[PDB]
């Protein structure tokens, strides 16, 4: 059994909504440390890694370490009942359901049946990325949306002093550019001129959970996967690994 | 002829919108006291009783007592043209149309044809309810929406010290609970342990017109109709009687 | 080549969105004075005349006078990427594309291909209007929407001391009236009692670009076109000429 409590139910709902666009079923592992979940999208192109440490919860009691399998759409639909100011309680007793309770002026408790999800057969290659870019959330969210207007593919180019996202359709073309003079670009570390391209329909989902003022970390390499990392409630970490399009 | 004037056209529009989800055609009776309307939904499961006393109108002149029949959808579509700060004037001369005028920076006058509506052949049984619950509007609106996620039916249970709404679908389940310790519960009077169940699709419409901070009165009995009462502009009263599902 | 810069990208987007509801392809002529565009809708019922003087731009450099042909839907889709606080830059080099750049925390540059648009074979008759009405934007926007509820046609009537818009459907009817006592009516000049009627589906698009507090000028005549003029950023001028319905 466990009980974990999170203040601000909507914010937790938004996090599961983000992940649920990419992931249909996920194993969430509860330990004394926090909650972890690792899962691939249906095309097996994006890996999601979510870490929610104890410190982001108001009360956190994991009496025994336990992994539960969750339908993400169903989980999202329930969480969406939560208000911005609801307190959210997730509690598991021995039965195969998760109790999900919202506390405000009343106590409203849902029962979500759990499912059997087989955990990832992980064979991640070494990822010797050659470029790291830290940019403001707003730039990345804007840029992806700009590129989706234009193409189904977006190219990322990192050079010593500039980060460029470029996309080209039949008719239209966009280029989003960033040098260290721009407010949007917080850090750029480039070992070597680095270029790779990615499917935008994945990127469009990945960036939905980003706040405008978030620092977002990108790590990538030449025709290599993109690693995209950002924080949830400062200490929670949401990490995507996205296969390249080439 | 009559002329009644209501300050804040949108608020009047919202009231007719609420009722129009359940009622297609209604007889509104204008007297010196105020306006009354009583009507059943098309399934003959919900009775609506609306009372709008003189005191909620800025100017109120009913020269002769008169009942008019109104298509509610049409009435709603026109009222929806009104702005939050429009003044609304309803005036009837001898012709079979209602003049509906919005006054702001201009005077905009609609003509709504009236129709012949046969008034209710009322045979209401005695309703010896055994439970009264007064709760905050927000709890009832939340709870119904929670239950609609889960089921087409909702069960209400009232005991001496707790009010519970419960719903169960194929897969999901919710329970909304209230004791006198909760802010949501303002009054509970229970003669006898009381249980009844109701169609949620009716309840979902009934609660649309409720403000978050409204006191809502429920009266019900074992496998008996639910009476749901709340106020409009403090002195206007909107009362539903809803047949049980059993 | 030219470069013109406009502070507040959304506001420019809203202007092109307004025009794009009526106009599919337009020739924009850039001179030292400002930008002008004149075009007819596909039914050849509405003429649009837009004038954007230098003074509404933050920086304005037109090195050579040049006319470019623009697909308005495409232009609108790109401009819609702009934020309220983006700076917008339109720049043309010798190639047949317009560069459209949004500058905020990053610099985002789109390429829009240009097209060949044959310029208007203008034979405008003399328009001896007999009525001028200056009214508040809010009244005109409300009134058109009121009339569209009711009919596909709206009649405008101007007399010495009153302006009336009237519409009549099968069942419903509206009348929007204005005398100089109303706040909505800023100026009325009538040579002669003046009546004309117009298609509302045109008027509904024409009024979308009007702010609530705008002074809007109407000039019309008996069974004559309506001239509707209002300002953009105080000095830019948007003028429609709309053929009568009779």
PDB file of C-alpha atoms in Angstrom, chain A residues 138-139 142 145-146 149 171-178 182-184, chain C residues 74 77-78 81 83 86 102 104-113:
ATOM      1  CA  UNK A 138       8.648  29.722 -25.066  1.00  0.00           C
ATOM      2  CA  UNK A 139      11.131  29.564 -28.018  1.00  0.00           C
ATOM      3  CA  UNK A 142       6.844  28.645 -30.726  1.00  0.00           C
ATOM      4  CA  UNK A 145       4.486  25.275 -33.894  1.00  0.00           C
ATOM      5  CA  UNK A 146       6.055  27.481 -36.584  1.00  0.00           C
ATOM      6  CA  UNK A 149       2.722  25.105 -40.134  1.00  0.00           C
ATOM      7  CA  UNK A 171       5.697  26.039 -50.576  1.00  0.00           C
ATOM      8  CA  UNK A 172       6.543  27.515 -47.147  1.00  0.00           C
ATOM      9  CA  UNK A 173       9.776  27.684 -45.100  1.00  0.00           C
ATOM     10  CA  UNK A 174      10.704  28.768 -41.558  1.00  0.00           C
ATOM     11  CA  UNK A 175      13.968  29.293 -39.692  1.00  0.00           C
ATOM     12  CA  UNK A 176      14.154  29.908 -35.925  1.00  0.00           C
ATOM     13  CA  UNK A 177      17.496  31.236 -34.935  1.00  0.00           C
ATOM     14  CA  UNK A 178      19.252  31.799 -31.657  1.00  0.00           C
ATOM     15  CA  UNK A 182      19.066  36.343 -27.655  1.00  0.00           C
ATOM     16  CA  UNK A 183      17.150  36.058 -24.392  1.00  0.00           C
ATOM     17  CA  UNK A 184      15.788  32.649 -25.629  1.00  0.00           C
TER      18      UNK A 184
ATOM     19  CA  UNK C  74      -1.365  31.857 -46.472  1.00  0.00           C
ATOM     20  CA  UNK C  77      -1.764  31.614 -41.384  1.00  0.00           C
ATOM     21  CA  UNK C  78       1.823  32.806 -40.937  1.00  0.00           C
ATOM     22  CA  UNK C  81       2.102  32.756 -35.378  1.00  0.00           C
ATOM     23  CA  UNK C  83       2.351  37.077 -30.472  1.00  0.00           C
ATOM     24  CA  UNK C  86       6.191  40.238 -31.125  1.00  0.00           C
ATOM     25  CA  UNK C 102       8.770  37.775 -35.626  1.00  0.00           C
ATOM     26  CA  UNK C 104      10.732  38.408 -29.326  1.00  0.00           C
ATOM     27  CA  UNK C 105      13.066  36.217 -27.269  1.00  0.00           C
ATOM     28  CA  UNK C 106      14.075  34.618 -30.615  1.00  0.00           C
ATOM     29  CA  UNK C 107      14.073  35.663 -34.306  1.00  0.00           C
ATOM     30  CA  UNK C 108      11.664  33.525 -36.364  1.00  0.00           C
ATOM     31  CA  UNK C 109      11.665  34.048 -40.102  1.00  0.00           C
ATOM     32  CA  UNK C 110       9.154  32.732 -42.601  1.00  0.00           C
ATOM     33  CA  UNK C 111       9.420  32.745 -46.406  1.00  0.00           C
ATOM     34  CA  UNK C 112       6.136  33.346 -48.247  1.00  0.00           C
ATOM     35  CA  UNK C 113       6.169  32.758 -52.033  1.00  0.00           C
TER      36      UNK C 113
END
